[PDB]
Amino acid sequence: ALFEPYTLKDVTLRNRIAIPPMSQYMAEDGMINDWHHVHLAGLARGGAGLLVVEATAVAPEGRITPGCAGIWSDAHAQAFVPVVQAIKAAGSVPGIQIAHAGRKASANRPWEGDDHIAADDTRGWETIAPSAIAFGAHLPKVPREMTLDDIARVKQDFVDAARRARDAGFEWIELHFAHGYLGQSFFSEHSNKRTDAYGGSFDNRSRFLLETLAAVREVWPENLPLTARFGVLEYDGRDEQTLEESIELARRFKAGGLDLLSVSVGFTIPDTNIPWGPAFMGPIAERVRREAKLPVTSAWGFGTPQLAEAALQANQLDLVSVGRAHLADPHWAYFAAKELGVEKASWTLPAPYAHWLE
């Protein structure tokens, strides 16, 4: 099942393996470089059906860190062009996740402190959010409360991002409404205390996300999968209530043209109890898939080929996302093909490798 093709709109994946977006923190002023080119091209040659490029910021202040990729100008977009072309040459589908880190922005690289940049550090910048409330813990900076014009500008930033991604050749797009960044923070009552049209009720908290989806839909081709990542629960003790609302929004996403939902956890606040474990997201992903009638993917511990296979056969997922295993071994898909007994498994890789490994 893991090695069956998958067709969504006009795009066909050679198998059900997806490489989720994985920030590399190697960009400079949003510009990617040979780090990203070799990293992504190598992964694509590895065998995976779909390769989703890391969170790429729609605006400079939307970066998580000073090393995050960006696409907030045509020059930033043009940098992706050769990389998209190499992904394609390798037979993998190029996707990109476009993002805005909201209140979690302006942080150090994970191996350089992983915390909010000091106030006197010339690399830092003011963060924006639905409300002037800090995440807390290692991210103590209070964001600036967004104005209506801020909301209009960020929405237009996402549209400009999607248009650039389209013109750079990406065949799959993913809106980053998860992991406690801007979009997610608009939906959660934890982070959104607004009293205008973008806060309060379910409809108001959904507005930013729905409006961003719709605006992007106007520039993104109808024949290329339009997707989003969304934290459907927080493990904050409000799980049944949050899940119900998240699934309702899923339905609205579907109605608004979303082709697939990447299902995750919110990470909106630090005060939570997440039951980490191999494929722990499976049951939750399955429920979203069932109740909103929407294809889904998820991640976390599916680097065990049998687990990925089990999730597919149980129809908990339509694609299995495999992250860290690909950082460890860019040729993981070949390893999975061996594990699962695929005929001529070495031909998961290109000929200059496959010939000698068969």
Residues annotated as catalytic (active site), given as ranges: 181
351 Cβ contact list (under 8 Å, min separation 6): none
Contacted by 20, from ligand FMN, a copy of itself, none: CB < 5 to 8 Å by type? ligand FMN
Output the smallest distance, CB 269 to ligand FMN, in A.
18
14, 16, 45, 166: which one contacts a copy of itself (CB under 8 A)?
45
**Nearest to 105, CA basis, from 170, 154, 164:** 154
Rounded to whole angstroms, the Cα distance separating 305 from 301 reads 10
User: Which tokens hold the place of 325?
Assistant: 């295993």
The H-or-E segment that residue 55 falls in is strand 50-57
Output the smallest distance, CB 132 to ligand FMN, in A.
25
Complex with ligand FMN: residue 109 or 217, whichever CB lies closer = 109
User: Which tokens hold the place of 69?
Assistant: 């990729």
Name the H helices within 140-201: 148-168, 182-187
331 lies in the binding site for a copy of itself (CB under 8 A): yes
Query: What is the contact mask toward a copy of itself in residues 111 to 150, using x (rule: CB under 8 A)?
Result: x---------------------------------------
231 lies in the binding site for a copy of itself (CB under 8 A): no
Which residues share a beta bridge with 177?
Answer: 230
Output the smallest distance, CB 333 to ligand FMN, in A.
13
Contacted by 330, from ligand FMN, a copy of itself, none: CB < 5 to 8 Å by type? a copy of itself
**CA-based torsion, 254, 257, 260, 261: positive or negative:** negative
Contacted by 328, from a copy of itself, ligand FMN, none: CB < 5 to 8 Å by type? a copy of itself
Which residues share a beta bridge with 52?
Answer: 95
Output the smallest distance, CB 301 to ligand FMN, in A.
5
The H-or-E segment that residue 324 falls in is helix 324-328
Complex with a copy of itself: residue 110 or 257, whichever CB lies closer = 110
Contacted by 35, from a copy of itself, ligand FMN, none: CB < 5 to 8 Å by type? a copy of itself
Rounded to whole angstroms, the Cα distance separating 325 from 340 reads 16
Burial 192-222 (b: 16+ CB within 10 A, else e): bebeeebbeeeebbbbbbebbbebbbebbee
**Phi, psi for residue 342 in degrees, rounded to 5:** -65, 135
Residues of the shown chain interacting with ligand FMN in the complex, contacts defined by CB under 6 A:
20-23, 54-55, 97, 176, 178-179, 229, 299-303, 322-325, 356
Rounded to whole angstroms, the Cα distance separating 159 from 84 reads 20
Output the smallest distance, CB 261 to a copy of itself, in A.
24
Pick the piece of the chain touching a copy of itself (CB under 8 A) from 7-15, 127-135, 281-289, 331-339: 331-339
Residues near a copy of itself (CB under 8 A) are 24-26, 34-35, 37-39, 41-42, 45, 86, 89, 110-111, 324, 327-331, 334-335, 349, 351-357
